[PDB]
From a paper:
Formation of this complex catalytic core in the large subunit of [NiFe]-hydrogenase requires accessory proteins encoded by genes designated hypA to hypF in the hyp operon. After delivery of the Fe(CN)2CO complex to the large subunit precursor, nickel is transferred to the precursor with aid of protein HypA and [name]. [name] belongs to the SIMIBI class GTPase with slow intrinsic GTP hydrolysis activity. Many GTPases, including [name], undergo GTP-induced dimerization and in a recent review, Gasper et al. categorized them as “G proteins activated by nucleotide-dependent dimerization”.
The only structure of [name] available was the MjHypB in complex with GTPγ-S. To better understand the structural mechanism of GTP-dependent dimerization, we have determined the crystal structure of [name] from [name] (AfHypB) in apo form to 2.3 Å. Each asymmetric unit contains 2 monomers of AfHypB. AfHypB belongs to the SIMIBI class of GTPase and adopts an α/β fold with a seven-stranded beta-sheet sandwiched by 11 α-helices. Electron density of residues 67–82, corresponding to the switch I region, of chain B are missing, indicating that these residues are not ordered. In contrast, we found that symmetry-related AfHypB molecules may restrict the mobility of switch I of chain A, and hence, these residues are well defined in chain A. Besides, the side-chain sulphur atoms of two cysteine residues, Cys-92 and Cys-122, which are part of the CHxnC motif, of apo-AfHypB structure are in 2 Å distance, suggesting the formation of a disulphide bridge between these two residues. In AfHypB, the conserved Asp residue in the NKxD motif is replaced by an Ala residue. We have superimposed the structures of AfHypB and MjHypB, and found that there is a nearby Asp-194 on the G5 loop, away from the G4 motif, that can form a hydrogen bond to the N1 atom of the guanine nucleotide. Modeling suggests that the binding pocket in apo-[name] can accommodate a GDP but is too small to accommodate a GTP as the γ-phosphate will clash with an invariant aspartate residue (Asp-66 in AfHypB) on the G2 loop. First, in the apo-form, Asp-66 on the G2 loop is anchored to Gly-118 and Lys-43 by two hydrogen bonds, which are broken in the GTPγS-bound MjHypB.
Numbering used by the authors:
A (entry chain A): 11 to 213
B (entry chain B): 9 to 66, 83 to 210
């Protein structure tokens, strides 16, 4: 962790020098990190210069979709690690020095990323209701580090037997300071709130 | 899933171990929990009655490379060397988080925690303490001199992991070090 902390500080300073705001977006595979990133690019990509670093394996169609908006994007090679670390992006940040907002998609995992500072400005932790409504209480460590917690695909809550209000309450008990958004991209629920949070951090 | 390959090598590991009669122990705990010391004093005690192989994530050292945990693949390469061992003692990285997801193919899981890590270390790390078969609270004799509520640690562990066995241990006094043997023995 010592070498990570060192590179993490360098990533943070470099991000400060360029005025780029970086968001470490964590969550299990299927939590919907990629779609949220695309939808974001689609909504404010014209007003705001966005970079994307994708640390989950992304399909070809999704790579086309993100790159289609002329947005700078790239797969992060994570090799054998169950999480990103400051070293993985240390040499990549320069290519993104011209972005106002750098969206960093972490590995699909709710455990390993806890202890790794990437040098980011904000941490988001995404969870889908399809993961079970005890997923927050099962993973206190990761939910504690979040500045914003996204409970996702809520319009499927009933269908899957998941209790959204319990997920919200467990999140708040574990992390009293974090903003919490209940989100369903299909129905647009929570999206404006998400965008508003991004505008807040860029201004 | 992303652990698909780890699961594959874990089964393969779980086979080689069984067919060789070798029993493996995943030993987890913080960077100072005292895993190395327990292993030494384990070999010093019953290292004459049974053959003990040792792999250090922190007898041979395992290079974890860029990872924060051991994975089944690191074990798999070196398993042949220990096919003629009664007991295999695997010392995982000094880390209470990463090792949670990673089956190594082992028979038993132990998590060691020093009282010098705080009396809420247990409650802060439910995920790992939940996979333990045995939990070792170590250096207990320093609990008072450091202001750590040992009874709290236990309650937290029992809440999170009822079926797990718990031992209070201090090697400066060989406290609990004997029931640790009673455990291995079985
Ligand atoms: Cl790793």
């Amino acid at each position: 962790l010592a070498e990570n902390k060192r590179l993490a500080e360098k990533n943070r300073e470099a991000l400060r020098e360029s005025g780029t705001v970086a968001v470490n977006i964590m969550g299990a595979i299927g939590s919907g990190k990629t779609l949220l990133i695309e939808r974001t690019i689609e909504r404010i990509g014209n007003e705001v210069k966005i970079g994307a670093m994708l640390g989950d394996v992304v399909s070809k169609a999704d790579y086309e979709r993100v790159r289609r908006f002329g947005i700078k994007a790239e797969a992060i090679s994570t090799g054998k690690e169950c999480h990103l670390d400051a070293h993985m992006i240390y040499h990549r940040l320069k290519k993104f020095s011209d972005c106002d907002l750098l969206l960093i998609e972490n590995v699909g995992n709710l455990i390993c990323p806890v202890d790794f500072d990437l040098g980011e400005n904000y941490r988001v932790v995404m969870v889908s209701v399809t993961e079970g409504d005890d997923v927050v209480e099962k993973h206190p460590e990761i939910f504690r580090v979040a500045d914003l917690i996204v409970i996702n695909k809520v319009a499927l809550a009933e269908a899957v037997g998941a209790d959204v209000e319990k997920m919200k309450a467990d999140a708040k008990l574990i992390n009293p300071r974090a903003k919490i958004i209940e989100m369903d991209l299909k129905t647009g629920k929570g999206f404006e709130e998400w965008i508003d949070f991004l505008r807040g951090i860029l201004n």
